[PDB]
Design a binder for this molecule. Sequence first.
Ligand SMILES: CC1=CC(=O)CC(C)(C)[C@@]1(O)/C=C/C(C)=C\C(=O)O
Lengths: 545, 545
Amino acid sequence: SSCFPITLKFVDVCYRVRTILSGVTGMISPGEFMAVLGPSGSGKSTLLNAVAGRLHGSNLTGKILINDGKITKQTLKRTGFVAQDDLLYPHLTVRETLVFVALLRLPRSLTRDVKLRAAESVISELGLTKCENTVVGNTFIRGISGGERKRVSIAHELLINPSLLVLDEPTSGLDATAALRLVQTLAGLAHGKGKTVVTSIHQPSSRVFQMFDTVLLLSEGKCLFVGKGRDAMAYFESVGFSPAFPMNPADFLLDLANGVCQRQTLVTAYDTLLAPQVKTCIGGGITTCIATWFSQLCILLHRLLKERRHESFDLLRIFQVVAASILCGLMWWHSDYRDVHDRLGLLFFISIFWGVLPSFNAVFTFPQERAIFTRERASGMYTLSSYFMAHVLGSLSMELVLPASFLTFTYWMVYLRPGIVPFLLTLSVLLLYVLASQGLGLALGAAIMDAKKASTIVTVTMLAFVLTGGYYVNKVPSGMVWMKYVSTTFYCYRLLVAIQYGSGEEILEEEVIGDVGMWTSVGVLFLMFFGYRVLAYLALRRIKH
Amino acid sequence: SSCFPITLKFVDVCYRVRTILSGVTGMISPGEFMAVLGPSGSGKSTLLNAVAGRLHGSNLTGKILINDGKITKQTLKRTGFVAQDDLLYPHLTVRETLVFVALLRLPRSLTRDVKLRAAESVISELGLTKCENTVVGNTFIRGISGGERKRVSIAHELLINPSLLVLDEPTSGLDATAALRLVQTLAGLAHGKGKTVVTSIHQPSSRVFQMFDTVLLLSEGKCLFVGKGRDAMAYFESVGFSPAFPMNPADFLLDLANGVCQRQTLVTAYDTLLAPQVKTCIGGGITTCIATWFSQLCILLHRLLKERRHESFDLLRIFQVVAASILCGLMWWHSDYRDVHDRLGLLFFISIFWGVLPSFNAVFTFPQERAIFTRERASGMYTLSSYFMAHVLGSLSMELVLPASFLTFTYWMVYLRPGIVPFLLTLSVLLLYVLASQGLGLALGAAIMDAKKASTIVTVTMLAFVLTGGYYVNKVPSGMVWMKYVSTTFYCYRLLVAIQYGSGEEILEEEVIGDVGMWTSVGVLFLMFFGYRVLAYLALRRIKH
Ligand SMILES: CC1=CC(=O)CC(C)(C)[C@@]1(O)/C=C/C(C)=C\C(=O)O
């Protein structure tokens, strides 16, 4: 219950890029709820973002100090920044969202019994105890309300028990009566638990402004007032400013910020009477560290299990595989093998279809989760190498179910080779070709990080793999014959003809007998399996935070 | 300057679907600016939407009367409803947005000289005279600000010179100083031009509330107050309600609406003293009507000219045609004609490529403009049959430029038949096949009106057109031989072989000699040109308003 108070002080100076801040000074006591209010463009989104400790070094000079000391990464585990946008996964319920977060945030030396009841204490500490089985959703999946998405985001940050909670415009997008009941619980933290809540309200209401203990005006840099907030109106009356009509106190002193009198004399009056009074108050880790890698993998596989299933077994993607499998069983119904030219066109349609679908659907995976990943990683929850291996191991499970259902339905209708040993070789070649074609699309989406531009580069790439696959053109013109050795469609189609026909000898046009080999064609699809996953990792470690 | 005043009166009763409204009475004088404010769910979005005249008949009973009469379509040309969302075209500048609207809204009997200076009077009557050459844009195209998108929407409605302007939450999404300067011009209309502006502000500010002449509270049905707005605070003081702390007057009396005292005694006190005092105040057209059809077509072709060009000459669609034309000229470089099997696979790749691209890109045209069309049509600007023929005639101009550039580059590299009469027959067959494949996608998107679901039904349809086109399967199994006669890819590929080879006789495998005919293959692609445009119209007149 916060038996470690943080007395935040800051006497900093400008933050340039023009100056955003210029001269801000102030101090925050434990047990106070403070609002930082000002016009749009006054740098209130930077004073919060530089007193949590997220801006430093180059163009930020000052003497920000926590607890009469220095802002250190030791005194940054007791600090929580609730940002302005919410980044949650949709298909998880509210209770299992905060249990997956509680197993990753809280340290390893505890047990899994004082760790998942610290996640259902925060359920009842905020108001999230009625909606704990509703899914979260988004604006395509019906779930919790917009005032309870913000309460999950604050509950995401209270699991580590901070002593300083910085929030960046919480009540933005909330209606009139949920923005009031969210200020009631943030004022209850600082008055009941002894924390040091600091927030920046955009345009406060009339009875929201009564819930504050301290305000701080910012007008394009320097500050005009810092004080109790019940005596802000009486202060400017002594300077000679009073409203002409009954009005909100937070509309009055925010009009005085952007020059509208009812801003040159206001700054000079501040550094004569009020600013020189707040200045007066101024041998292991080898075998365990590999075992902590795999528990981060076992939790990241269970979180993303319903996310790797929504995109895989989509209902408009089941319809495309069921439609393509009735058309193959009807155009090649009860086929004969003694007419080679139709049997080779069946086997080449399977190479086109299962190279285009896994590659095109794989370019959307990494661009859509870049914002969630770079926030979740820069708080010490996981690294790149365990998030990457949860997408690798979780996507080669789900994507083998629709090609195995295509080939059970179609193999025995179209009369391919009878036997259990030719059926299992045709299935094995096709499931390796689907995994080698997926990795082409994973590498292209990670190198580009735009879903529209990556979609037209995997489309152009597969066009050159189909045309060099060996079915349309018989005599490649002598400077383009090298190009077929880099395509995945070439090695699959030359394998499938080797199961069904072998090398002549029963059917003897020598488009059956090839020029590659069989172990050379399965040794290269393994090189393209691993090789396109290594290049997807290196394109992702290039986005240096 | 509004020399026709409208004195709006309404003594209506409930509007059910539960009751939304219950007992509302009131009257509006000319020259008054009135706000309709209340909590979210109190039916203030229906009292406006039923006093403009957009709700009537079944479950709406009352005695709404304009100018001591009856609400008639004669007295509805002097009425303007500014809705809550803005539906504009992005690539147009602000000046030519309001000139294209001025040629369609203002009547035909004027000239085109007192019609396009009535569109640059409204430019300066509002504040749209500095940004009149900036494009409008959206949130993908950088253009005008969000407070000036709302001023174009009010300028869209002032061209007909109304005398009663009803606005539905104008200042929603605007910041603090643009919401004030938009109320300054709406208060200037009613105080300077004599109009009868009626609006519904969501959460007014402190000095926005000083700009009102009349308010009307609504609490879930019945009304609590209607009066001057400068004496709303003194009225509830006589009922026994006063604030305990200095506050916005529009936050106080909106908390009294949803029950929070500082709502059962408030309604009963209204129908004793205040409600029985507002009740006391209570032979041509044949040759001209075809000439007015084509001027609506000549303006709708010029509006949409930059919209049919942004989607056609997209930069990621030029790259796909330039890439596919280097790969054809390189895999078939300097080809020989005496080897028939490679020449037939070239001609079938052109049939696949130019059937898949026009059909897939055409399903997005009509779903993305359904909201703009059904608003713009139910105000008497155009009909369905002139909006349809501007999309038909405007899309068969732009989509013939990339297939003509594909075939100029590639025909002479791959060594097809030399001559000017075989070159112009190959170009003519391909440009008819692109127009017949576009109309398949126009008909599917108009029948479904969802872009995701229509994209997987044109993809399944073209898969059955490719497999029955006549290249992969040689011997179709006796109950599927009918199916090739409905595919567009069949008739194109059998035409292209007839230009290049004829019927044997120089090359004599009889996959050259077909079974259809030549005039039978061009008579059916014309039947699929017109036939897929008739079905797209009938699917669009099915959405009955
Ligand atoms: C691989 C590819 C990408 C494109 O550029 C478009 C295109 C339609 C040509 C294609 O889908 C090619 C499809 C082919 C050759 C055959 C088919 O589907 O039967």
